[PDB]
Structure formats: C-alpha cells, structure tokens
Amino acid sequence: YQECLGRMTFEIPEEMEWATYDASRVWQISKGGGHNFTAEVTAVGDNGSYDYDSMIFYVSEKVDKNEFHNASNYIKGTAEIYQDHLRENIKLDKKAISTLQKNKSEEKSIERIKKGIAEMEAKIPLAKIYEHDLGIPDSHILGSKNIPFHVLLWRNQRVYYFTFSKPTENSAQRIKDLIARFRTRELYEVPNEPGICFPYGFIADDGKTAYELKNSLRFTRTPNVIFSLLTASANDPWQTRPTSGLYDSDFRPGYDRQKWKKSALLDSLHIGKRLAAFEGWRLDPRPDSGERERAWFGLAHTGGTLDPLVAIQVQTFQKGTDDLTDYTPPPEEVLPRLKALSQSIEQR
C-alpha cells in the first residue's frame, strides 16, 4: 500500500486513485490541459515536465486503439485546416491585386503586397505533417520534414504523449533513447532505481536531471475531498510556485452570509519529518435554518530551496456536482488521514 509521484514515495492509508487524462478527450491531446478526475471535480494542470529537450507528458485512462488513431487524426486535421486557411488567404490576396491593377491605380504598394504574397507562399510548405516509424511497437510518431516530435504510445490501454519544444537535428535519436529508457508501471508498485514516478509509468535515469510533476489524489471512501500533490526539483528552469492553479478565487470564495458562516483554517501538519503550516479557510452552516453543506480549502508547501519542493493542496467539491452523492464531511473527520499520509513522504 505505497505509491510514488515524481521522485518521492509515500504510504497510503486506504484505497486510492490517481488522476489521468479524460478518455472522452484523449483524441485532442495536442491541446493538453492535464489529467482530471471527472469533468467538474478536476484541478488545473496535472502534467509532468522533464529537462530532456523541454519534455512534457500526459497519461490517459483506459482507452482503445480507435481513440489512439483518432488522436493522430486530430493532430493531422489541425495542420490540414491551417493549410486551407493559408490557401484562402492567397486566393483573397490574388483577387485584391487583380482588382488593384486597373489603369494606373494606387502605386508604391504593388511591391509591398507582392512581397507579402512572397512571404505567405514561402511559409507554405513548412506546415506539412509527416509521420515516422522509428521501429517502435505501436507508436504514432510525428514530426517535421527532418526533425521529429509529438511522440505517441499505447500500452495496457494507456496513452503516452511526449512533446519537445526544441528538438535538434538528432531528435529521433534522443526520443528513441528516451522511450527505450521508458517502462510501464502499475498502481501500488514502486521500483528500486532512480528515475521519475508518474501514474502508471516510470523512466529510469541517472537521477539528477531536472523534473516537475503535479497530480491530484482522492480517497475512494470520501470522493467529496481531493488532494493534489506537487513535486519539483531544486532550482528548476520553470520555477513553479506552490499555488500553481488556484487563481485567488478558491482563496476567497463567494457565499451568502445569511445561510452559511466562514472561518479561517490554520492547522498543524508535518510532511516527512519537517513541520509544515496549513493556511486555508472553512465554510460552516448556520443553525438559523436547515443548512447541511460544507466546503473548505488548505495548502501546505514546505520545501524547495535546496530539497525538492513538496506541496499539498486540499480542495472540496459540493454534493451533486457530479456522480458523487454524499455530503461533504467536516475537516476534522478527514484531516487525520491526511496527517497519516503526509508523514510518510520520503525521497526515494
């Protein structure tokens, strides 16, 4: 009963589930937002980063090869539609210049519009989408004319997408090395070598290259309350902040003072061995009339300057927002289990 995220491992008190990409959204993964629980009980931005040529990856839930094909179909359709738009611009410009050339009309702009057309046509061929093979079982690998990127994979009914913002001339070499080092993994399984731990995956390395992962967590007993785990290396090139996706609206929610009452939430919670603060808020019903609903928020983020940054964000979801049909338990009911989980976090 233990799991690892990023480079840290922890012990889980009871049954748990990770957040993976939406099966209904798998095909449009080039526009990646992140993993989610369901449509409405998600968080913002659950995905991982790696310093190997500015790498980002996502993990899908159980999908099939039809959706795996639909993903590359969408990636191709994007470039197709851009080509169509580019061609219609050329058509409109040609009609405009044909109407312009009429009996010594506007001068000193024909060269301008012609050089514009020249640029517009020069940037035409680079938008073609080319597919590759690379000798990888069941991989829809894409890329440019020579430099490849946008990796795809399908193992154990999962999807692994690996994109690199700055691939060089040896991009195929680098990405095939990386996917050679890649290895699938299973829930409640923790390896014994340095690498990266994300839900249902592990890539081994020397254990020193920078990383940044974030995911959300939820007990199967209490679906109304979720916890999102944040991990990153020390002094990473992205300098991710402890909040990272809260937008100063979950800090100060709106409510009617007539039927509910709010209060601060400062508790005690030590992660690993070091002690951490817990600054948030609590929403409590008032005994004036029948009000049985709750909500609260909290965040603890000790670390980062020398050790890997570890942040825990607690967020509650109201009854009836989704398939969940249970009232929100008060914080004191579920905080003991969070304390039990937080004390068992250690780095490899």
Binding site: Q28, G32, N36, L92, A96, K123, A127, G254
Partner: protein, 867 residues
Amino acid sequence: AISAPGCFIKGSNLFSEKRAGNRVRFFTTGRDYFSDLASALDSASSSIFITGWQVNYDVLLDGRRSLWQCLRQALERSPALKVYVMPWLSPSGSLGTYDFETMLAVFQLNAGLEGGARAFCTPAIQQSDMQGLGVAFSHHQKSVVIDNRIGYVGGIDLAYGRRDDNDFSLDASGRRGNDAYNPGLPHLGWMAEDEHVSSMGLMMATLFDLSGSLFWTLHRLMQARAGGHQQPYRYLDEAPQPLASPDNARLAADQPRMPWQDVHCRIEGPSVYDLARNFIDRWNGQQAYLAKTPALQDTALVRSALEAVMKWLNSLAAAAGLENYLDEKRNLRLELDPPTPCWINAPEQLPQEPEVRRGGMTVQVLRSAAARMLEQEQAGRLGAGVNLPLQVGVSTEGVQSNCKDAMLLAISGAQQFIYIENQFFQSEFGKEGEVFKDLPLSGPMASLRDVGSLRRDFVVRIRLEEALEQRDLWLLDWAEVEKIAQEPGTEARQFLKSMLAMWGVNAQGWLTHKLGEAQHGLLNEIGEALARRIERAIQREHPFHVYLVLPVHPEGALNVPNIMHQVHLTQQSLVFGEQSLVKRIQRQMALKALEGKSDPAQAREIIERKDARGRPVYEQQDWSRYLTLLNLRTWAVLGGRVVTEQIYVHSKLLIADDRVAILGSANINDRSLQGERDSELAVMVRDSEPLTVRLDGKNDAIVGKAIHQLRVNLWKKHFGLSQGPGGFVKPASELSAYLSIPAAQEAWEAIQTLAKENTRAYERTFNFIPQNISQTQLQLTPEPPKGFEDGFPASIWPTWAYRKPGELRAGGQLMEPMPYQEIFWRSSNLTSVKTFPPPNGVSGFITALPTSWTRGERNDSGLNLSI
C-alpha cells in the same frame, strides 16, 4: 393580417392587443429622429410624457436647439401644458458616470413659469422578485408621447452618441463635449480650461441658490417646486455651454469617434393611447410606492445633512446672500414638508378612449414586467382612483414576457426569411466546447484575475490579501503601500497605478454568489428558436434563411473582465458551444444527408464519430445555407494617421417576411428577455397594404412596402451606398441589384464574399483589430526557416502571443500595443509611435465575423451571470 397564417401573440398577461389605424413613420438614423422630435415638441399643446433609460437635456435636436430649450419654449407657448418625465433610477449613486443632472434640469424647467407647477418628475425604482440580486436591474423603457396623439418608441434614447449621420464618420472635432462617444479608447482631450461648465459647479450653485432617504427628500423638495422667477440661468437659457465628464477630458482630434447605428419609429393613432395608459399606470404605481413613510432615523440624518449644507453655505461669505422661498436665509424652520403625490387623475390628462379605425398600420405594444411591478401598479390605480377602460385579454397581476414570446411566435410562424439586427447575443449553448475546467485560465484573464502571481516578494511584505478579503480601507496597510510606492524602479512606479486599478476592480467580489448555488447557463431561447425553425426547413427541404448583425464586441475596452466574459458567452452561443447554433444546424444537416442507409436510433450515434480529419461527422456540413453572421467596421484618416473603428450596432430591429418590422428595447440577453428582471417597450407593427416583390428572383411575393423600404435603406447604408461624397469608404454598388432579394442564394453569396474581402484588407493593414490568426506570433525568439508553421488562433487581445496555448506554465505577453492603451496613441518621447500604411480595396462597412477569435481560451470572470 390574413395574408399570412402568423398572427400576434394572444395569451393572458399581455399588456395590450393589436390596434389598427396607426400612422407609422420609421427612423433609421438618430439625426432624423431628433429633428422630428423637435418639430413635434414645437407642435405640442396639452401634455407630454417622457420615459427613457437615460435622458439628457444637453443633446441637440435640430443642431441649434437643445431638448430642455425646446421643452421650455413649449411651456412658454402653452400656458396649460403638463409635462411628466420618468427616467430610470439607479438604486446606488451611479452604476457608472453617465450623468446625474436630469433631476436638477427638470427643477430648472419650472423656474420663472407663470402659474402653478405644471411639470413633475419621478425617478423609477426597479421591481423584481427578491431585489437583493435585483439592485442591478433597471428599466429599458423608451417612449415619448405628445398630447396623447403622437408617440415614439424604439432604441434611440435622448443621450449622447446617438445622433449619427449616414456617412459614419470617425472625426470627433465637430461634436461638442460629451457628444464625442467612444468608450473603448482612453479619452485624452480637455475642454474646460475656461469655457465649459463643471458638473459639480452648477449643482453646488443651485444649492447656494436654495440657501437612503436623501433622494426621497430631494424629490420632496422637487415636488415643493418654486415655479416662479428665481434666477435667470446663463449657462442654459442664453449661453448654452456644454457640460463635461467628471474628469472633464474629451476625445482628442486624432482619436476616432465610435459610430452608432440604431432604429426608431413614430406612431399616431389609438396605440398612442396604449402608450399613454402604460405611462400613467407606471406613474401612479411609483407615486403610490412613494406614499410610504421613510425611516425616522433616515429623516434625521437627512435633516442633519441639510443643516450642515446650509451651515457651510452661511460660512461661505459670498454665497450667503438672500433667500426667499422655504429657506429665507436661515431665518425659517427646517425642511420636512409633508408628502403630497401628484397623480394623473385629472380628466384632461386621462386619454380619451380611441375609436377602432381600419387599415393603416396595425401596431401592438409589448412590455415585460415583474409581479412586484404589476402589484405596485394595482396599488397605484387603487390609490389614485384611476381605472382606464381595458380590452379583453389584458392582465394586471403576474409577469409579462411580451418581447420574448413575440419573437418566439414570429420565429415559429416565419415562412421564407428573417433579418435580425441587434446588440447582444446570449442564449443557451449547452456545455462549453473546446474549453475545459482542467485547462488553465487564459493569459490576459489570469493576469487580471490573480493578484499574487506578479512580484511575490513585493506582495508578501504588503500582506494586503486579508485587507482585500475583509474590504477595509483602514485594514489596508498605509505603511506597506507607502513603502512599495517609495521602492525604487520605474516598473514599480507603474505597478502602483496597476495595483490601485486592480483593487478598484476587485474591491467588491462578493455581491451574490450562494443565492441558492452557483450555476451556469443562459435562459432565453431565441437562439434555439432560430435553430428549430432552421431544422424544420431542413426537414421539409424547402428554402429558408436567417441573418444576424451584431457589434464586434460590447461597448467599452477589451480589458474589462465582464466585457471579456460577454465575449466568451457570445462566442459560445454563436459557434464555440457544443450545442450552439452552428452545431445544431450542422447536426440536422448531417442527419438529413445520412438518412439514406441508416437505422433510426442508430443514426443518432452514426453522426457522432470522427473522419480522417479527426473531427465528428456533423462538423463536415456547411451552415452558410441558413446563417450569415456579420458585423460593421470602417476606417479614415484623422490628423495624418490611419485609424479604424467599429460601428456599434445598438439597434434592436427585427424583420419577419417583409410583413413585420419588430422594434423596441429588448436585447438578446436574459436580463431583458426573461421578464422578471428588466422592463421595456417593444412594438410589433403590421402592414395593411399589399405589394408585389420578386423575393428570390423567380417567384412573385406579396409583402409590405414600408417594411421593404426600411430594410432596403438599412442595407443601403450598411453597404456605404447612401453616404455623402468625400467619404473614405467607397460604395458597394454591385449589391444594389442584390439588396432586394433576401431569398435568392446569389445575394447572400455576394454579400459574404464582399465581407470576406473587407476583412482580408483590414487584416493586411492592421493586426490589433480582432481577427482569427494572431500576427504577433512571428515577432518572437523562434526562427521561420527552422520549419515553424503552426498558426495559433488570436487571443481576446490579438497582439497577445502564446508560447504554448495548451497549458499556462509557458505564458506570453503582448507584442504590440492595443488601442485601449495610452502608448498606442500618445507619441511618448522615450519610444517611437507606430503608423500603418493606408488600407486599400475596402468597400462598404460590413466585414466578416471572426469565429476563431479566442479559440480554446478560457475567459470567465467568475462573477454572477445575472450581474
């Protein structure tokens, strides 16, 4: 009304029924309406009722005389005149900075008038279900009825920026003061060095001349009116000096005004009685509401306030002169005059019941109102002892949604074509498509929304998070804000103003959230009405069409979160949403084209999976067979620089088979269409004379002539053909043939191609204007020769560039100034201003509507859908 199966609305809560024998004269520009209003007021003899969303007396009617001047001349001419004015009242001091001088102008309207007080003013209080959320609601009723015989209704309220000519000119030097309307730009002029009139100066001057129940007592002293000679005012009676904004800044010479397109009508007949009954009932209801006794504590507070005001006036040695009415230079008692409402129970003021006449132009008056408003009007009728005779089918308790139900019935009864020209578009669109909750908040919106993202070290010292949460100026730390102001750095110096603006925006963020629970979704059903009619046309496979003309973006700058959220909801309703108008049309067309070899229940899933492009089946269909969404734009040269500006389509006009020309003041948002929030006056005019027309070029049709001419003139202006010589926009003469054919396809194909050509020319010249594909992407670190051809959709600020749109860990910024910024227009010495080569090939004012603007970008402010 027998030439078509479609008839008026016929329910129970209807305010009134159709009345024939009406003389209807439509108006297409504001100038014509103002001129006709001046002439009618010059003809006025007996009684005038005025109601409007915003009434201003600074406006010029005929170009030489203002509204207050015309009204005063009417009063001088008629010794038995009776004027009642009923604007809309904001429950707070002011929602914005429109004006606040209407009450004092009506006060000065009785100054020096022989005889008793023949004029009365009564601000209108909104009335809805619970009003806790309803404080924000208003009255959108516009009407002027003259001598119970001539009435007006439309969307053009007697306000600034409404009087526009056929040319659609961008030059603002001609207009005076507050008449140069352009909310988008930061106005950078200045008028009141020594010429114009300060807004505060005249009101404190009127306080000097005199020598929350404050509004109640001010209207009480308004009712206790000194109609005799008190003082000849220079600035409004012999020296008509223009007013100014609170900051008294104007639109600069090289800054374009914002053109304004609206429609209006004049009526004469028995329906003027309908409008007069509406005004009288509302006036009586508001008087009865006023009859309630206010709080004694509030009365004492107002007494102390007026005592302090008169003490300050006495301390002002120059101001402490002489008084004669109700004050007597402090030698009299206090001001607690007993209330005495002035009803409209006089038999002269009561309109006579009009006879039923035949033919002409039948008109119906439509109202939306709340149960509270109706019960207040019943209370007013009982209190004043006034009960006008009513037709059979009218109700007085309940709710009205006459505008919404009327639009629904016209949609359900239309046969060939519909033309719409509106201001807003907010209906149901399903659950949002291409936008998801896991997706990070957009670039610009996140910059506006999050307050700790920028300068974490500078925010952790001020620690004003708790201050802004608790909403306390004293809790705001003066020491920390002063330390940050004194911190070194020009960027810090700008950051002080930026964070002051952020506090101004975010000070009140808890208006009404948990009134029940947070929900999403629009309520009114005009969009799905269009979709259902279009789908019936698809199902029967016979020609039908619908247009929509709307503004590019709502009034104001594009850096205001509520305006951005309205753009989000507009795009979701139009196209983006998963069950939008385009999606519903595409689904029906796919279902039709796939009805050959497909099981009934199976097809509902067969139309769903993707093609080789990866996109679902129904996305392959072309909706341009049922929809032509268009906007309006122009350009000019002011002061040696190329400028462009949108034409705000503020009209609320609607056409139904060239037989009906709807008009009024109901938008396409819930706040106006649902009925329980806001009140309005829309009319539903019906013709009575037949005219032949070759609508589709092959089959003859029998429609009206006034409606046909109104639509022809609307298009004629819309294409630049009606404007005068010398303009910067050439006419679209090739559409003079196609204007009269709304059912032939070649007409809409021609207009659509012209729209696309105009859009392409504008895109070639400018890049800050809204378009689909961002042009600031090229100005970045990535090099073109490597092989970077992505073409990202433009954001809500089209110069904003995205390094990676999918997430927010990358981020971006603006690469070139936006028009609402100051560095756009002001040639700062430390930088160099950017100019653009003149555009070419641009004919007409209509341009394509950008449906890839803000694609996959999350612009939600988190504020109430109602407010």
